Write a protein that binds this DNA or RNA. Structure first.
Lengths: 234, 56
DNA sequence: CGGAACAGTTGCGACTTAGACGTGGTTGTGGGAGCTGCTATACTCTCC
DNA sequence: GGAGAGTATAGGTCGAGGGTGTACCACGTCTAAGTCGCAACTGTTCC
RNA sequence: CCCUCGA
C-alpha cells in the first residue's frame, strides 16, 4: 500500500573470503522475513563443484592406513573434502593424482582435466616416505549445498570406491542477526546483519547477488499469479 | 517458529488458560521528573506521581 | 525631549450602621472511654 | 547492701489509591461590612 | 498519620 523509506545495503569486508552486509532500515518484522530465507538461500542455492568419491590404489576392504603414507585414510578424506574446485562440465569428471618417492603431496600436484580449476594448490594433502607412492582418483561433480556420504553411494558402486561428503556450496558459513534501528519516533525498526564467509571460488558480494537473483525469481513465481496485484513499493 | 519458519524440535505443551488483566498498569506507574514542586516545610521535592514528585 | 498650568482618579480617612459574637449570671440532679492480644533486652529504682 | 520490678529501648525498604463537627438564653459589646468627602495624587497639554 | 494494596 504505502511506500517505506528505501532500505540500503552496505558491505564491510572483513577478509578476502569474509564479509558483513547490513540491510537497513526495514519495516518492523521484515528482518526475520528476509533473514532465514537469505541464509538458507546463500547456503543451499548456489551451485559449486566438489569431490564426490575417491579411489585410492592400495586400499580395498579395510580402510585404515596406507603403506608409505603418514596420514591415514580418513585424514586424506578430510584433506580432500577441503579441496576447492570449480567445474564447467555439468557432468561428473574424474581427475587423477599420482606421486612417488619422499616428499609432500599437495593439491598443486593434481593434473586438472580441461574445464576444472583447483583454487588452493598449496593445500597439503599427504606426505610420503621413499618406499611409498600415492595413486588416488577423484570424481568431481557440480551441485548445490551439502550432500552427505550415503547419498553418494552408488548402487553399482565399484570395489575400493570411497564415497565422501560433498560440499558443493561455495559459501562456508552464514549467520544473521536482526537489530533495532530508529526511524523518527519508531525505535523498533529492523536492521539485518549477514555475516557470510565463502571459499576463494566466490566473493561474498557475488554470493549475495546470486542468492538475491534466485530469490527474486522464486517469489516472482508468486508475483506472476496476478501482475495487477498491488503491494509495497519502495 | 514464526521468525525462521523452522518447526521447534520438540512438542510443546499447549492449551487454553484463563488469564486476567490486573489493575497494576504501566500507565498509572511510569513517572519521571526533572524539577517540580517542593514541600514548603522541608524544602525537599514532593512525592507521589499525582503531585509530580521525585523518587526517595 | 523641560517647568508650570490644568483637570481626571485612586485612596486614605472619617463616621454611621446591623448583626455576629462574646459576655453576664449561673442554685433540685450530675464521676470518661478504652483497654491491655506484642516480643525481647538492659538497667536504674525501690521495696526489703 | 543487694535483689526484684518497673521502666526504658528496639523492632525492612520503596511505591499506588482513599480519608469526619451533640450541648443556656437574653442580651449589650464589639466588629464586619460599608457609602461618602477633600486632599494627595496621578496624568495631559502646552510654550 | 491511618485504611488498603504491589515487589
Amino acid at each position: 500500500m504505502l511506500i517505506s523509506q528505501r532500505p540500503t545495503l552496505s558491505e564491510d569486508v572483513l577478509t578476502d573470503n569474509r564479509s558483513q552486509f547490513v540491510i537497513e532500515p526495514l519495516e518492523p518484522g521484515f528482518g526475520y522475513t528476509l533473514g532465514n530465507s537469505l541464509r538458507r538461500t546463500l547456503l543451499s542455492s548456489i551451485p559449486g563443484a566438489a569431490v564426490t568419491s575417491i579411489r585410492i590404489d592400495g586400499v580395498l576392504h579395510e580402510f585404515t592406513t596406507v603403506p608409505g603414507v603418514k596420514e591415514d585414510v580418513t585424514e586424506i578424506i578430510l584433506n580432500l573434502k577441503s579441496l576447492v574446485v570449480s567445474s564447467e562440465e555439468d557432468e561428473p569428471v574424474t581427475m587423477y593424482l599420482r606421486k612417488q618417492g619422499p616428499g609432500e603431496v599437495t593439491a598443486g600436484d593434481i593434473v586438472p582435466p580441461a574445464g576444472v580449476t583447483v583454487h588452493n594448490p598449496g593445500m597439503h594433502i599427504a606426505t610420503l616416505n621413499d618406499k611409498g607412492k600415492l595413486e588416488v582418483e577423484l570424481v568431481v561433480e557440480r551441485g548445490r549445498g551439502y550432500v552427505p556420504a550415503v547419498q553418494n553411494r552408488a548402487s553399482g558402486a565399484e570395489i575400493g570406491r570411497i564415497p565422501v561428503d560433498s560440499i558443493y556450496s561455495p559459501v562456508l558459513k552464514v549467520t544473521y542477526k536482526v537489530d533495532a534501528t530508529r526511524v523518527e519516533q519508531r525505535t523498533d525498526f529492523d536492521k539485518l546483519i549477514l555475516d557470510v564467509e565463502t571459499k576463494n571460488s566466490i566473493s561474498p558480494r557475488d554470493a549475495l547477488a546470486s542468492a538475491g537473483k534466485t530469490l527474486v525469481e522464486l517469489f516472482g513465481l508468486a508475483r506472476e499469479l496476478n501482475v495487477e496485484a498491488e503491494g509495497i513499493e519502495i | 517458529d514464526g521468525r525462521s519458519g523452522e518447526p521447534f524440535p520438540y512438542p510443546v505443551t499447549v492449551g487454553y488458560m484463563y488469564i486476567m488483566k490486573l489493575h497494576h498498569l504501566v500507565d498509572d506507574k511510569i513517572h519521571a521528573r526533572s524539577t517540580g514542586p517542593y514541600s514548603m516545610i522541608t524544602q525537599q521535592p514532593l512525592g507521589g506521581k499525582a503531585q509530580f514528585g521525585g523518587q526517595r
